[PDB]
Amino acid sequence: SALRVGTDGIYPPHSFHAQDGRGELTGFDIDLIKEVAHRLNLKVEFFETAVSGLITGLDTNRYDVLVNVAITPERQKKYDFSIPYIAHRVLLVVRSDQQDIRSFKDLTDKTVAQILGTDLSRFAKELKSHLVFSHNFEQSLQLLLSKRTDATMIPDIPFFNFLERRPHDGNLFKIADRMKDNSAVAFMMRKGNNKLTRSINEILCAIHLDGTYKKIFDRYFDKNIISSVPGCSS
């Protein structure tokens, strides 16, 4: 039988297409949930969904597992999470010549880009910027350098991914602040899916042990920069 998985499919390197959008669905999260499926003896079924419809696809039962979801207390209330399988940090990016903005605390009434997908709206309310949405990091960079924005807030994973893709890119921008603590990310299911949560959990543990979590991680992230999560025990 089939393990139905919803995703946006446009968040490199979590869930993206091989290039210009025309190659297969791939990414760290994808290979991992595929691995999980293989180990539950299931053929995985992907449901690419617009960012706005990702949770409501769960609620609606278009699919059963949702990829690349940050744990929030109110999500733990209403849904089931797996054990965390990766984490990220928010970075604050600005123009190289920017001097008035040096911290998350400097963003008050400044206009600040967030790339859709990155789920940063709630963290950004507190902050208390006037917030705009960009399609990808390149788009935001065009806004940043032209001054249509005062900053972009982006999670590190995608940031550093951009830097590996385009690694001789001007030094036209910089990191002005970095989230000290980091934020756990996991698979999300409807509340009640409990047989399903413990298996995922169980497989994720067995994936860590036998060396596959590492394999898959190194395929996509630099271990030196990007935070992993913990291992397991036999």
Taking the complex as a whole, how short is the minimal distance between the CB of residue 178 and a copy of itself, in angstroms?
11
| Cα–Cα nearest to 109, from 99, 93, 124 | 124
Window 165-204: contact mask with ligand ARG (x via CB under 6 A): ------------------x---------------------
Query: Does residue 126 interact with a copy of itself by CB under 8 A?
Result: yes
**Phi/psi zone of residue 183: left (φ > 0), alpha (ψ -120 to 50 degrees), beta?**
beta
Query: What secondary structure does DSSP assign to 13-36, as a single string?
Result: TTBEESSTT-S-EESHHHHHHHHH
Query: Does residue 72 interact with a copy of itself by CB under 8 A?
Result: yes
Query: Does residue 115 interact with a copy of itself by CB under 8 A?
Result: no
| Cα–Cα nearest to 113, from 74, 142, 152, 164 | 152
Residue 77 binds what, of ligand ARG, a copy of itself, none (CB under 5 to 8 Å, by partner type)?
A: a copy of itself
Alpha-carbon gap, residue 104 to 5, rounded angstroms: 35
Query: Does residue 119 interact with ligand ARG by CB under 6 A?
Result: yes
Residue number, 96 or 108, with CB nearest to a copy of itself: 108
- Give the list of residues 6+ apart from residue 72 with CB closer than 8 angstroms, or none: 122
Alpha-carbon gap, residue 45 to 217, rounded angstroms: 22
Query: Does residue 181 interact with a copy of itself by CB under 8 A?
Result: yes
DSSP state of 136: S
Residue from 32, 83, 87, 90 binding ligand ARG (CB under 6 A): 90
| Cα–Cα nearest to 157, from 19, 8, 52, 28 | 28
Residue 118 binds what, of ligand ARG, a copy of itself, none (CB under 5 to 8 Å, by partner type)?
A: ligand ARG
Query: Does residue 108 interact with a copy of itself by CB under 8 A?
Result: no
Residue number, 52 or 99, with CB nearest to ligand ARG: 52
Taking the complex as a whole, how short is the minimal distance between the CB of residue 107 and ligand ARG, in angstroms?
14
